[PDB]
Homo-oligomer: A and B are copies of this chain.
Amino acid sequence: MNTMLFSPYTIRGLTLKNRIVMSPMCMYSCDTKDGAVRTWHKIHYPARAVGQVGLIIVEATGVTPQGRISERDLGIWSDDHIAGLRELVGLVKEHGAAIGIALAHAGRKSQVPGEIIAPSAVPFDDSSPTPKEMTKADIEETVQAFQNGARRAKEAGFDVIEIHAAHGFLINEFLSPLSNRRQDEYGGSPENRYRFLGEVIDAVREVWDGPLFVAISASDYHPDGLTAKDYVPYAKRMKEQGVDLVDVSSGAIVPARMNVYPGYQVPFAELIRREADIPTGAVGLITSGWQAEEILQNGRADLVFLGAELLRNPYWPYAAARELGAKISAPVQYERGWRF
């Protein structure tokens, strides 16, 4: 009847109607290949809003055309993108939900034709292009791209920003010593590997005072790589720098074996939560409403992030609320249809 999953959650001054969040998931549907928002996105994202998702994070959006994963990604490297994005914001908020955006750079895992960049000139695998080692100029400009992305997102009317430092992409690559072999201030030590992310958090916080997430991969799944222990100092640092919540997933820095099963990334989300004393978001194989409730109720995370579950059902919250016997607001058009 009276559950935690469907309880409000305030981040800074922004209040989410529930703890359900849509994770960023690339839709590869910018057919115009210019980072533009499209018909697809205007159907896809508000559908989850209608289904009572409390916070919807728009897919990894490239801060530069270089930093796209693919050519068919969304972009925010130009003021021309603000209008497309502002409409998307309107269409999602109109139907109840809050909206965020994952500012992203794909680093050495970019599949865009041409030069791709990374902290060190070291490919993802045997089959991947070797990226260009970044100059201090490249670094500064990339931090600047992130700041501009944030400025644009603010102007488009987003409620939340997520700095995307996960899944083997640029920022994640600086953090992991597998990929960061630099011998200047940006590599070589725990504090140095953090600096890139740190300057991005500062750079974004200059132009944006709203709710701020950071996505991480808490484990590299590699003997010589990082583990969730390593992100505890980093999360403590993020807290001081003003990061409000940590979106805790894992993996994808280098090819690796991964044991996948229900809530397999929850203990990462909890370790960072308790040890760094910072709010976290759990993600990855959260099927039922029951399972989400246990996560929140046992202080494992503060928001449950959903992925395929919301691709499989955009109205998953209604399904979960039936399963938990909870009362939630139906759009007025579906009140009688959602017979409680």
* Interface residues of A, Cβ cutoff 8 Å to B: 25, 27-29, 39-40, 43-44, 46-47, 50, 91, 94-95, 307-308, 311-315, 318-319, 332-334, 336-339
Contacts and interface: CB of A to CB of B under 8 A. Distances in A.
Copies in the complex: 2
A50 B41 CA distance: 12
30 contacts: A25-B337, A27-B333, A28-B332, A28-B333, A29-B333, A39-B91, A39-B94, A43-B43, A43-B46, A43-B47, A43-B50, A43-B91, A43-B95, A44-B50, A44-B333, A47-B47, A308-B336, A308-B339, A311-B333, A311-B334, A311-B337, A312-B315, A312-B318, A312-B334, A312-B337, A312-B338, A313-B313, A313-B315, A313-B318, A313-B319
Question: Is the contact region of chain A dominated by helix, strand, or loop, or is it mixed?
Answer: helix
A123 B28 CA distance: 56
Contacts of A334: 311-312
Contacts of A307: 337
Interface centre among A28, A337, A338 (most CB of B within 10 A): A337
Nearest to A94: B39
Contacts of A91: 39, 43
A44 B43 CA distance: 9
Given A27-B333, A47-B314, A307-B337, 9 more contacts: A28-B333, A43-B46, A43-B91, A44-B50, A44-B333, A47-B47, A308-B338, A311-B337, A312-B318
